[PDB]
Design a protein around this ligand. Structure first.
Ligand SMILES: C=CC(=O)N(C)CCOc1ccccc1Oc1cccc2cc(C#N)ccc12
Ligand SMILES: [Mg+2]
Ligand SMILES: [Mg+2]
Lengths: 551, 403
């Protein structure tokens, strides 16, 4: 059937006219399939034979992937029609569904063909069935409903569907309906007996508007294979993940792989992908082979271990609290769970972005709560309570001394090592009775060779030669040196704005191994204080390392 | 209320297509209540899938009474069509700000332009698609509305200006800026008059500033009983920075005091030439800079530095080192005043001060993680306008110089 629904007006992109693609000639067999399909479609008003004054065309084809079916190429037309409100991009997350007593899946048959097309826009849908060997003119047709594969069909159909639904959901506030594509998911908590009646009502209401639907004999049954998920009546889970075993991996193979891992991490606590992704930092042709690293091999092996078990998630209950826990999973890697009752998770997830070359643990945990907060708003329209492995002391001190503005949800500390700690703390005041190193460093911006040296208030002076470095990298080595050659308490003094900022940041993890080494030093130290002076000002202590490293 | 000014987007410019930010269920509910009545009063209508445009909407508070705020930043960049900003407003002893934006909804919007004002009320977890409306009347927040209504506004204020020839009235968006050199009690009385004279001409109205204090904070050097190598290096380091701006600062005598390879903690006494060089550098920092001029054709940029203990420093400039204004804001903890609360209050103060002085909004470099801002900026935002912003990583060697 077609719909007595009002049509949506359509226009072409301004200053554009309709497609005039010529028709490819076809096989008499394929011509026969279309002629029958087009007379049937004509008999239902879906299309109409048109006169000879419609200048436009779009190719059409016939095929049956091994019943016949007709397919049209609307590429040129879609290029010319106006833009529409974007049809629903994101689908809902199973973790955001409220458990229902009974739930029915209804597929709309021939959805798009059931809806009328705007009148003045019909002329631009013209197509043509070729006559056998161009002997006589072919047969012109045009569409009266939403063509399949046209640009307007999804948004206009969904719009129509919404209005068609409106009157019914006004007389049934107790029934919950989702529309997604050509489907409708209807659920209720009414008795499964009457629930079958209300399903019967709505089917009829849709039939009165032109929407054919399935029967109690043909309505899909649980568990529901929907969008890579399994929806069970009491639980939800992803569909089974199968990760290939290969001796070589291309860029394409690794992309598909982190995808599936990304997928599974929404219910499988513990997935990690950081070392696997580091492989895709190459970002080159998708066929290039990437030698897997030892870290990549161990990560994927640990992923296979977790995927060995089955997991499931649970549905949402607006009357129970919403709670989130975060765990450290390794350098840069974190994992979280969201649950309303202790062992039944709504969902899980991971966070591992560095967001820069160097970070510390508190910054990364805070960035994790950020990620959870956004996801909680999207899925449940609220933010959760956080249980976190970090004490007020730790976090309070961090965000107070942090130069960036930061928001801290109320949380309860949960003791579950690894707790999150500040592995160290530079000094706010210079250190009395500690040796005052004056570090510096340098490299030749052409030969790349360089030296890092110091001279201290106690008379000591060193210089270490360096090959294939940069003025920045040496400036960090100067500090590294002063830490190696120092007592438990050291005042360092530098002219390098670069190296100062990297240190004041107080990182506890890094990309360059140098900065990792410096961190190793900083931890062992008891008090470290670091100070800055303008370079080449003849300060004193700084003039002397500059002269030194220069000679 | 039958004349509809025609409005057109700049040449070769389509309308906004800005994504809508997800909202808490509490905020969505407030938006559906607000829009259900605004549909009844026929100020907005539901739109169909043939409208691709979209502009974001947020719910704010400005007492249990939710309000709705629209981000017309993108459509304002794109309309930009147009028909001597009062230099004396910043000088006035007092200035009061009045919300006169309800006035707009009297007025119909050009029929052909309504499609561009489309907005979505989003659903939770993509259950439903949004509710899509578009505006029938002049919406608050669009630069178009103060320009269309300009006529009526001059009309309604002619009585009052004639009476009060020395009072300055400037409009920016939904706000009237009213300034007297009067005594305060007098000032609030003159404000009540204009409020009443506006109401009785049917223009509903629901913050008083003092630009006679706003001053570019001059550079401040420490006063210490006993200096140390550290404190001299700090002092020489800061005075070194200040010397890209003020020419007269010298450090020869001051660094002379550090010749050596001294322990940082060592106490150095301020010899005379050094003390008299630091004293002279205190009097150079008293003067203001030489040749820094507002260029009206160029953007104003504002940078902000978290200073701990509720303090925040800011600079407004159009060219690096050429500061037009500087200042520092101090909060009072108030059993909360979180970082985001304070940054958000601060940003609004800087923007008002910026509106007063030059009549436009600065572009903000904000010391915060972008995703954190996009989540919590509406829980403290009261103004009806929204400045452009971007997110930076503040250098740690300029936090202390501006301290
Ligand atoms: C009994 C199982 C259960 O409790 N579910 C599936 C969640 C209930 O939530 C629904 C509420 C109203 C209508 C349908 C509901 O359930 C679905 C929601 C979203 C997408 C769905 C998709 C399919 C398919 N195929 C089936 C059911 C869906
Ligand atoms: Mg140097
Ligand atoms: Mg929107």
């Amino acid at each position: 059937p077609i719909s007595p629904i009002e049509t949506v007006p359509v226009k072409l992109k301004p200053g554009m006219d309709g497609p005039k693609v010529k028709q490819w000639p076809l096989t008499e067999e394929k011509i026969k399939a279309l002629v029958e399909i087009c007379t049937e479609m004509e008999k239902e008003g879906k299309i109409s034979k048109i006169g000879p004054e419609n200048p436009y065309n779009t190719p059409v084809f016939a095929i049956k992937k091994k019943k016949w079916r007709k397919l049209v190429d609307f590429r040129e037309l879609n290029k010319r029609t106006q833009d529409f409100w974007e049809v629903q991009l994101g689908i809902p997350h199973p973790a955001g569904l409220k458990k229902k007593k009974s739930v029915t899946v209804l597929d709309v048959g021939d959805a798009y063909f059931s809806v009328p097309l705007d009148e003045d826009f019909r002329k631009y849908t013209a197509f043509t069935i070729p006559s056998i060997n161009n002997e006589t003119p072919g047969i012109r047709y045009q569409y009266n409903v939403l063509p399949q594969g046209w640009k307007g069909s999804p948004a206009i159909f969904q719009s129509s569907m919404t209005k068609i639904l409106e009157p019914f959901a006004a007389q049934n506030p107790d029934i919950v309906i989702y529309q997604y594509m050509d489907d409708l998911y209807v659920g209720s908590d009414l008795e499964i007996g009457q629930h079958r009646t209300k399903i019967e009502e709505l089917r009829q209401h849709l039939l009165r508007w032109g929407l054919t639907t399935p029967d109690k004999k043909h309505q899909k049954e649980p568990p529901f294979l929907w969008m890579g998920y399994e929806l069970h009546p009491d639980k939800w889970t992803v569909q089974p993940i199968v990760l290939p075993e290969k001796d070589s991996w291309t860029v394409n193979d690794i992309q598909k792989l982190v995808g599936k891992l990304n997928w599974a991490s929404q219910i499988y606590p513990g997935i990690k992908v950081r070392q696997l992704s580091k492989l895709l930092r190459g970002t080159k042709a998708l066929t290039e082979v990437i030698p897997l690293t030892e870290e990549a091999e161990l990560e994927l092996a640990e992923n296979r271990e977790i995927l060995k078990e089955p997991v499931h998630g649970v549905y949402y209950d607006p009357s129970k609290d919403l709670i989130a826990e975060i765990q450290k999973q390794g350098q840069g890697q974190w994992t979280y769970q969201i649950y309303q009752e202790p062992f039944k998770n709504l969902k899980t997830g991971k966070y591992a972005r560095m967001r820069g070359a160097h970070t510390n643990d508190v910054k990364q945990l805070t960035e994790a709560v950020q990620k959870i907060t956004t996801e909680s708003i999207v899925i449940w329209g609220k933010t959760p309570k956080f249980k976190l492995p970090i004490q007020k002391e730790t976090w309070e001190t961090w965000w107070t001394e942090y130069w960036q503005a930061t928001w801290i949800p109320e949380w309860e500390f949960v003791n579950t090592p690894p707790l999150v700690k500040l592995w160290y703390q530079l000094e706010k005041e210079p250190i009395v009775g500690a040796e005052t190193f004056y570090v510096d460093g340098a490299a030749n911006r052409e030969t790349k060779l360089g030296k890092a040296g110091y001279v201290t208030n106690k008379g000591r002076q060193k210089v270490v030669p360096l090959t294939n470095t940069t003025n920045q990298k040496t400036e960090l080595q100067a500090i590294y040196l002063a830490l190696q050659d120092s007592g438990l308490e050291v005042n360092i003094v530098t002219d390098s704005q670069y190296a100062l900022g990297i240190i004041q940041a107080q990182p506890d993890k890094s990309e360059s191994e140098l900065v990792n080494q410096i961190i190793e030093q900083l931890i062992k130290k008891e008090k470290v204080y670091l100070a800055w002076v303008p370079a080449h000002k003849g300060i004193g202590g700084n003039e002397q390392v500059d002269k030194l490293v220069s000679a | 209320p039958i004349e509809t000014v025609p409005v057109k987007l700049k040449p070769g410019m389509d309308g906004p297509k800005v994504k809508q930010w997800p909202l808490t269920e509490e905020k969505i509910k407030a938006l559906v209540e607000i829009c259900t009545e605004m549909e009844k009063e026929g100020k907005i209508s539901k739109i169909g899938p043939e409208n691709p445009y979209n502009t974001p909407v947020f719910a704010i508070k400005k007492s249990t009474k939710w309000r709705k705020l629209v981000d017309f930043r993108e459509l304002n960049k794109r309309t930009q069509d147009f028909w001597p900003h009062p230099a004396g407003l910043k000088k006035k002893k007092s200035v009061t700000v009045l919300d006169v934006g309800d006035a707009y909804f009297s007025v119909p919007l050009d029929e052909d332009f309504r499609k561009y004002t489309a907005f979505t009320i989003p659903s939770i977890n993509n259950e439903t698609p949004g509710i899509r409306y578009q505006y029938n009347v002049l919406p608050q927040g669009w630069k178009g509305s103060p320009a269309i209504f300009q006529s009526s506004m001059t009309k309604i204020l002619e009585p009052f200006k004639k009476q009060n020839p020395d009072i300055v009235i400037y409009q920016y968006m939904d706000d009237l800026y009213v300034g007297s050199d009067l005594e305060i009690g007098q000032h609030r009385t003159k404000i009540e008059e204009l409020r009443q004279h506006l109401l009785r001409w049917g223009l509903t109205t629901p913050y008083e500033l003092h630009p006679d204090k706003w001053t570019v904070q001059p550079i401040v050097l420490p006063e210490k009983d006993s200096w140390t190598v550290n404190d001299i290096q700090k002092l020489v380091g800061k005075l070194n920075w200040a010397s890209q701006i003020y020419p007269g600062i010298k450090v020869r005598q001051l660094s002379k005091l550090l010749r050596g390879t001294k322990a940082l903690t060592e106490v150095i006494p301020l010899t005379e030439e050094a003390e008299l060089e630091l004293a002279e550098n205190r009097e150079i920092l008293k003067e203001p800079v030489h040749g820094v001029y507002y260029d009206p054709s160029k953007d104003l940029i504002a940078e902000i530095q978290k200073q701990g203990q509720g303090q925040w420093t800011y600079q407004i400039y159009q060219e690096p080192f050429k500061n037009l204004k500087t200042g520092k804001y101090a909060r009072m903890r108030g059993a909360h005043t979180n970082d985001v609360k304070q940054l958000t209050e601060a940003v609004q103060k800087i923007t008002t001060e910026s509106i007063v002085i030059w009549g436009k909004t600065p572009k903000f470099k904000l010391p915060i993680q972008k995703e954190t801002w996009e989540t919590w900026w509406t829980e403290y935002w009261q103004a009806t306008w929204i400045p452009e912003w971007e997110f930076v990583n503040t250098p740690p060697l300029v936090k202390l110089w501006y301290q």
